[PDB]
Amino acid sequence: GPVPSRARVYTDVNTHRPREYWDYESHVVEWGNQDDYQLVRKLGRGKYSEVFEAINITNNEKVVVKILKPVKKKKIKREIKILENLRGGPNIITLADIVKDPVSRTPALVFEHVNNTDFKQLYQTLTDYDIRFYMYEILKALDYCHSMGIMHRDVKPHNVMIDHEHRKLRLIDWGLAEFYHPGQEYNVRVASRYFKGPELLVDYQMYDYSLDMWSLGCMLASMIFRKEPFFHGHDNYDQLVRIAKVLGTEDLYDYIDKYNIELDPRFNDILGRHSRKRWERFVHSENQHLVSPEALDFLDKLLRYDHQSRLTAREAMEHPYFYTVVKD
Numbered sequence: 001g002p003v004p005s006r007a008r009v010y011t012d013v014n015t016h017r018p019r020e021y022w023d024y025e026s027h028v029v030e031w032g033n034q035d036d037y038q039l040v041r042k043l044g045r046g047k048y049s050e051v052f053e054a055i056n057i058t059n060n061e062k063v064v065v066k067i068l069k070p071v072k073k074k075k076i077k078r079e080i081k082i083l084e085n086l087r088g089g090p091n092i093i094t095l096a097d098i099v100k101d102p103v104s105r106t107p108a109l110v111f112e113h114v115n116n117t118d119f120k121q122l123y124q125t126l127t128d129y130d131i132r133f134y135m136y137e138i139l140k141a142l143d144y145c146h147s148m149g150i151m152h153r154d155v156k157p158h159n160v161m162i163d164h165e166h167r168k169l170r171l172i173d174w175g176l177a178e179f180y181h182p183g184q185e186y187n188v189r190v191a192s193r194y195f196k197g198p199e200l201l202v203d204y205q206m207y208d209y210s211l212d213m214w215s216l217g218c219m220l221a222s223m224i225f226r227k228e229p230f231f232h233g234h235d236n237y238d239q240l241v242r243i244a245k246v247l248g249t250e251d252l253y254d255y256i257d258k259y260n261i262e263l264d265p266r267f268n269d270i271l272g273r274h275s276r277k278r279w280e281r282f283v284h285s286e287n288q289h290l291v292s293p294e295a296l297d298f299l300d301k302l303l304r305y306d307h308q309s310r311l312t313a314r315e316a317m318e319h320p321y322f323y324t325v326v327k328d
């Protein structure tokens with residue numbers, strides 16, 4: 001059978017918390033006044049929610065209203081409990097209220113509004129200094145939620161809201177987030193394809209916070225190399241092949257051998273043999289202003305097959321890549 005794995009940090013945070021903290025199925029939702037919020041414009045629709053810009057008529061302030069699609073009350077209470085546990089943390093989106101929508105007959109989560117810069121304009125215009133700054137702001141949110149016993153499991157550009165005018169960042173959409181419990185096996189059908197960690201792609205279920213650090217590495221690679229997404233697989237199988245053409249197949253075998261994992265035999269015809277590449281190969285005249293030795297070493301230390309070998313969020317904040325970022 002597979003070899004078990006534990007997070008190397010924050011391993012026991014939920015065991016020493018009171019049970020109420022992580023036993024989300026027992027959570028009693030405190031409902032606000034649904035008439036306090038008037039929907040203004042539809043912002044988006046996802047797999048699990050519709051998102052609206054609204055006005056809170058008790059203060060005439062903008063808010064975001066996320067009307068959940070019908071799913072299991074467990075998944076709904078999970079997201080609510082996580083949002084309440086993390087409220088006030090650095091760069092965590094703030095849950096302001098929870099109301100019962102009378103049309104959907106589901107909960108509507110009400111959040112602080114972030115006046116977000118569209119991700120196209122952001123991606124094409126962020127400078128080297130901007131990228132280090134906002135990576136550090138994401139790391140603050142990830143170290144916070146990890147320190148609080150929670151992994152996000154859906155880190156990707158669309159879930160990082162940036163108000164570039166105020167240099168304000170918020171990590172959003174906690175609907176896939178989970179509590180980390182040592183030894184627990186989790187669903188591997190989390191994250192968007194391009195940001196799925198190797199552990200998910202080889203069906204290793206006993207993963208942890210380090211999954212978020214692979215996703216963060218994928219974002220960093222796309223930003224400094226100006227290729228979005230960086231690992232651009234056609235499906236979940238081709239996704240692992242794309243990764244192995246960069247990190248090499250020998251270290252992939254070392255990884256699955258360490259955890260006594262077996263690859264899906266359908267990889268036999270598609271995986272091939274691939275050397276590990278040096279990150280400099282991805283540097284060219286149109287991205288070199290975004291690349292430094294520090295950037296490449298930091299990236300190299302996030303994108304490891306072995307989830308146990310990646311930088312933790314706190315270790316990442318110690319990296320020389322952030323030495324030039326002004327600290328407050």
Ligand SMILES: COc1cc(/C=C(\C#N)c2[nH]nc(N)c2C#N)ccc1O
Binds near residue numbers: 093112173
């Ligand atoms: C999809 O889950 C979430 C989404 C959001 C916010 C947005 C979306 N989608 C959004 N779109 N445009 C904006 N200015 C904002 C904000 N703030 C906040 C919390 C969530 O859990």
